[PDB]
Amino acid sequence: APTLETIASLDLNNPTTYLSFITNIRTKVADKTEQCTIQKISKTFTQRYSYIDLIVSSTQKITLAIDMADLYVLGYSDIANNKGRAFFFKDVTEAVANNFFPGATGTNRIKLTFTGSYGDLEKNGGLRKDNPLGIFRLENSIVNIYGKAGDVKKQAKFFLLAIQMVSQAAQFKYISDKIPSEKYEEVTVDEYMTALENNWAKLSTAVYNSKPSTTTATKCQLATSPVTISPWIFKTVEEIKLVMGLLKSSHHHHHH
Amino acid sequence: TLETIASLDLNNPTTYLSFITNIRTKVADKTEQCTIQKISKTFTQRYSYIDLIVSSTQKITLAIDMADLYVLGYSDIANNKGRAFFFKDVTEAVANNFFPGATGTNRIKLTFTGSYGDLEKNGGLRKDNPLGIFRLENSIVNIYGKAGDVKKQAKFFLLAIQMVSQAAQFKYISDKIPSEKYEEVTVDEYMTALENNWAKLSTAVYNSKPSTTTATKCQLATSPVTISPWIFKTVEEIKLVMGLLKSS
Amino acid sequence: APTLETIASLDLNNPTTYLSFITNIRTKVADKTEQCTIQKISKTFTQRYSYIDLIVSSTQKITLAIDMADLYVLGYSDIANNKGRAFFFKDVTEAVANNFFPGATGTNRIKLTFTGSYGDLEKNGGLRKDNPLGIFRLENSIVNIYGKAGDVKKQAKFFLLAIQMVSQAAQFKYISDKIPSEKYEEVTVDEYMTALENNWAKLSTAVYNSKPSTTTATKCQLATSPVTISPWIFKTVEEIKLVMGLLKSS
Amino acid sequence: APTLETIASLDLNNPTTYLSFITNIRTKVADKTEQCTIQKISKTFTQRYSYIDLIVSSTQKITLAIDMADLYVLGYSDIANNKGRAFFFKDVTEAVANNFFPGATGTNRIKLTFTGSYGDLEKNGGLRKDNPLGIFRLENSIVNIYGKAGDVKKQAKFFLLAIQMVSQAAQFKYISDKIPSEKYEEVTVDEYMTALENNWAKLSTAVYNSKPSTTTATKCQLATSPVTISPWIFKTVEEIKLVMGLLKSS
């Protein structure tokens, strides 16, 4: 089992640290060079897989399995009856999953019957608009599965919170910046939020395809304006920067 | 003649962070303190307008002092004539810079100031006046062209100052205004702690010391800086909540 | 349908009567004998089924169909096209529903397409956090459906206000005592309240499992401490007593 | 100074404990015998003066000087410059103040520049409606004055929250039952709350002057109906019982 780094940990009883935690994630995976003054995920990593911890107390945390290449959540790990236990998304290959959680062995390595797509998560845990985000919301979703028998509905509700408040919060300033430091306050996930969440690659490509502008703030101008991802109408790269925390990386192998 | 530095189409709520960003871009110095934007120390013209647009035929214009983002008054239309209201404590020399379309007897001095003590006393506690795009629009509809009603004017000012000025001062506030027009957000003790402590939080950054190991390259002169319930142990933590430092 | 008792009526234009109305519910359904000095719903009724009225005016009210055994809301009755009309949640048996509303006859007894679980009510009417409680909020939601054609969103919003401000309020003093005495003021349903609403059985069971004690005001002590219903962390039965209006019956 | 009991202590970081704290005060001061099934402050005490602690942390608390005869708050103690420091309301005589805080001596025994009347507190600290109640609000108000140089605004703002959320919270279920155990949530002190706060003796007198009843739940009926404490219109003693945690002694 390779040595994996824990690149960020969220102490859910310290809610004001949330943007510091998100910032750590952006800092760990981002390139040194920006793209139109927007951070972008690095194309390569020495070790692309890593952990992110979500802490409920000194003896209870869930550990996310992460692919830093795209900030995908691949599964998570808890502890049950003193044994380490790992749950992996259905579509995650054995070779990838084998990188994670050396304390989960044998029957405690569990392939879930669903993937991390929002289609699958909402099928099992309800529509995104019915799972509000928030610090305690995330904490409570952890309490409801930690050390417990596997429940797809509650696993899905946890995954909805964790993917949106960790992975896509890092990807989108628009998401991370809505989470209140008032631990018990919640944000409804509306169509403006889902629109961004479902169009991460489309927006990143629009930054990559933009042209250099000697007059504009981001020093870039869209190749084609507007970029419509309804209900958003993006007329400038600046307006894209206001929602983006990280661009998806570009390998420059194909044409856009 | 004064510039209109930003305008908010209350019916196109996605544009709100562009509108806040236009305010910050207009008033900020070219350079940052500890990598945080700060208000510019001087201005060719320190007074400007900010429009709050309800429709093609209806808007309220705020009078803004850009040196500190204070709202000094607003202007509407009543009986087909331009009209301006100014807070009690605004000098007539300052108020005179604003609204050439408001002449005659239609320039009015309000009986209260723009302080939260005054506004909350007349319009209700900040926790009882939730923020939101529609809430702001509706409060404008509730006073536009109407006889002066101190309570409804105070509710407008509570919404406008927080959703314009302090929204520009604090990313924490501006970034929680939902793009869903009819969604609102409560002004909780984390918001008011920031709102009450803009100068204190700016002073901590201006008094910080160089650091070679932190991302902002600053460290607090003494830690923590407490604006409860916030406990600020680093300048990066302050930076995450700030949109504009108070000008040195 | 037999003639059922109407055990309480809330005059929605006299908002300071609210806790008298909730007390009237508690008094009707509570057993004579308390558990750890907390009221509990009687195990037996001669007639478990009864009415609770929500009154908008002298001529406009909604009548809730109530199972007093668990304070379940099963449906409601209004008037539409000058005829008594009733709605019943999807999962309510015909035998149970036929106990209610003798003036809602003919074809005016309607099966709803959703149940009263919070999952069903919130997918149709929105999250508890987006449906604040309040006298006017309740009254308004009644006006938005009374005598109207079926509208699942508005009906579900009415049920959220009704179940939380009648049933759940009677069960939890913590909830009932937060309803504002001003008609037009409202209170957000936060995660403390929703934790209670989701865990009435678990909390009541924790009281039932408690051990006798001579030194505590409730004369009870927790079998295991704490009882955690996040965000609530209960270390005494006294702390549970002070949130509980009515224990689930044993 | 005599050695006085600390009859209750609120750990402001365990907000769920709040109603238990209030209950401890009521139990301590309440007579064995009730009046119209309302608790009444005992006519006498062997030692009427006592302490209540308001804990912000293991190292920082403020102790209230309390007169249990009437739940008057007479002052508070903190620590400044490594020494006990006492503050007493301006109208409290030396004889009374001498009962409290033996660890504060010399010039560390300080006469406040105002009394505990709401008129004095509002002059110095703002209207009650502009000073919302709340667990963290109270904690924040303590932090803002503990060990600090005198500040009449923050001292007054502390007393507004302390008197309302301790003394009058025990006097009035209406106040105590509104405080959320979500510690950041606040309650607006509107006309319904100030009306109760201003009329504690009048409401208590209305209870003592009440007549017997064989039917009502309290076994009392008002001597004259209604008892109006605007905006409240009390037609029954059951309605008064809903809002009151303690009667003033007669």
Author numbering:
A (entry chain B): 1 to 256
B (entry chain A): 3 to 250
C (entry chain C), D (entry chain D): 1 to 250
The authors write:
Mirabilis antiviral protein (MAP) is the type I ribosome-inactivating protein (RIP), which consists of an RNA N-glycosylase domain with no carbohydrate-binding domain. Ribosome-inactivating proteins (RIPs) are a diverse family of toxic enzymes that catalyze the removal of the specific adenine residues from ribosomal RNA (rRNA N-glycosylase EC 3.2.2.22), thereby irreversibly inhibiting protein synthesis and leading to cell death. Unlike many RIPs, such as ricin or trichosanthin, which inactivate eukaryotic ribosomes, MAP also inactivates the E. coli ribosome by cleaving the N-glycosidic bond at A2660 of 23S ribosomal RNA. Mirabilis antiviral protein (MAP) was identified in the roots of Mirabilis jalapa as a potent antiviral agent against the transmission of tobacco mosaic virus.
Because of the MAP effect on the E. coli ribosomes, wild-type MAP (wt-MAP) was difficult to produce by the E. coli system. It has been shown that RTA residues E177 and R180 play a crucial role in the hydrolysis of N-glycoside bonds by stabilizing the transition state during the catalysis of the depurination reaction. As these two residues were conserved in MAP, the inactivated recombinant MAP-EQRQ was expressed, purified, and crystallized. Here, we expressed, purified, and crystallized the plural recombinant MAPs, including both E168Q and R171Q mutations (MAP-EQRQ) in E. coli, and determined the crystal structure of MAP-EQRQ at 2.1 Å resolution. As a result, there were four molecules of MAPs in the asymmetric unit, which belong to the C2 space group. There are four molecules (A, B, C, and D) in the asymmetric unit, which are formed by a dimer of dimers. The 2-fold symmetric dimer was formed by residues α7 (Y174, D177, and K178), α10 (E238 and K241), and α1 (L19) in the α7α8-loop (E182 and E185). Notably, the active site comprises the conserved amino acid residues in these RIPs, including Y72, Y118, E168, and R171 of MAP. According to the assay, approximately 98% of E. coli ribosomes (0.2 µM) were depurinated by wt-MAP at 0.050 µM, and approximately 90% by the single mutant E168Q at 5 μM, whereas the double mutant MAP-EQRQ, as well as the single R171Q mutant, showed no inhibitory activity even at 5 µM. We impose the MAP structure with TCS/RTA with the eukaryotic stalk to see if there is any difference in these stalk-binding regions; in the stalk-binding region, crystal structures of MAP showed that the peptide binding region is hydrophobic and formed by Y174, Y192, W232, F234, and V243. Among MAP and TCS/RTA, the structures of these sites differ broadly, such that MAP lacks the stalk-binding hydrophobic deep pocket, as seen in RTA.
